[PDB]
Design an enzyme around this catalytic site. Structure first.
Site, PDB file in Angstrom:
ATOM      1  NE  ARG A  43     -12.662  64.295  31.305  1.00  0.00           N
ATOM      2  CZ  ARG A  43     -13.303  63.408  30.553  1.00  0.00           C
ATOM      3  NH1 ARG A  43     -12.684  62.335  30.065  1.00  0.00           N
ATOM      4  NH2 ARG A  43     -14.590  63.605  30.278  1.00  0.00           N
TER       5      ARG A  43
ATOM      6  CB  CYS B   2      -8.301  60.245  19.346  1.00  0.00           C
ATOM      7  SG  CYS B   2      -9.195  59.817  17.845  1.00  0.00           S
TER       8      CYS B   2
HETATM    9 ZN    ZN Z   1      -8.341  57.688  17.773  1.00  0.00          ZN
END
Ligand code: ZN
Ligand code: MG
Ligand code: NA
Ligand code: ZN
Ligand code: ZN
Ligand code: ZN
Lengths: 162, 162
Positions: free
Chosen positions: B60, B104
């Site tokens: 996180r 990502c």
């Molecule tokens: Zn991604």
DNA sequence: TTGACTCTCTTAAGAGAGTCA
DNA sequence: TTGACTCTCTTAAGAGAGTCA
């Protein structure tokens, strides 16, 4: 309890008691525009629930029996699977409702699988809509569908590619 | 509080920083036995992560900017969606990884939807395998498939019908 | 104003165990 | 022995907020 005989006796007592729960017919989407019918054996909404059963949470119950003068207790849906491995690939096995009906204790509506497999059935297209579960779904998952996405992938500049 | 223009400036600063994250090429299943390619912009494994970014949990992160002497902070994947409605159907909107890669931060790999819609993508057959998500999946979900069910529905006696 | 840590919380599929009568 | 309650925990998709320099 420890012995296979004792475990079978627990399974048999559980089945007999759950077999007396009210049988509620539910018509369900199967996928592919087809409908089917399930017969759920539903634990009561309030006490008394049945011999050996008690509610530990809003939709959680436990089954208990006294064996060898000791209390043995299990999650109410885990009893059919007491002779099965309790883990798979290092993941805990869970009782998984093929009918998506928590109060139901019909063992013909339960399987024993990882929590990920369990959860995933909520989105399955169903036995007539493309279910690939090796232990087949009984109905299309209640959350199957297009979703309600508020915003899709987007960028303001030119820094990203898919 | 922050004006539309100030929010746009936050989104632009976020994109400029994430755009400089390492870009990793991943080959992924699309469904229907087809393979595709996604380009993920991955936040580093350890500090420093990038201007404005800090880790609040194992996977996180948060983005922080101070505007007119006030500190503002957002979940690191929520920034692309600051000009969108934050709930739908009485459910909170969440950042949902179409690439299933938590690190990502590519906004072309994110959508903004209920937590149930978000979770369900884990089991989607994919854009070439039957995805019905209105905002289409970019790949087959990592958990799609036959599953690994240990035991299926079964009874020892004759107390139940399906 | 900024970085790098710290903490707890939400959800909805699931659990274990203790207190009384 | 059995019943009817109480409490917190697990997981993996996600969150908000505090402290210090
Ligand atoms: Zn991604
Ligand atoms: Mg389930
Ligand atoms: Na997700
Ligand atoms: Zn059922
Ligand atoms: Zn299925
Ligand atoms: Zn999809």
């Amino acid at each position: 309890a420890l012995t296979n005989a004792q475990i079978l006796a627990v399974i048999d007592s559980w089945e007999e008691t759950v077999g007396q729960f009210p049988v509620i017919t539910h018509h369900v989407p199967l996928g592919g525009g087809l409908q089917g019918t399930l017969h759920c054996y539903e634990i009561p909404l309030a006490a008394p629930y049945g011999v050996g059963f008690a509610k530990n949470g809003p939709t959680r119950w436990q089954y208990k029996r006294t064996i060898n003068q000791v209390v043995h207790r299990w999650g109410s849906h885990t009893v059919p699977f007491l002779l099965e491995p309790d883990n798979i690939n290092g993941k805990t096995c869970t009782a998984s409702h093929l009918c998506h009906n928590t109060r139901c204790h019909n063992p013909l509506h339960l399987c024993w699988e990882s929590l990920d497999d369990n959860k995933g059935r909520n989105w399955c297209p169903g036995p007539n809509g493309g279910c690939v579960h090796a232990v087949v779904c009984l109905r299309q998952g209640p959350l199957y569908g297009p979703g309600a996405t508020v915003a899709g992938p987007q960028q303001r500049g030119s820094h990203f590619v898919v």
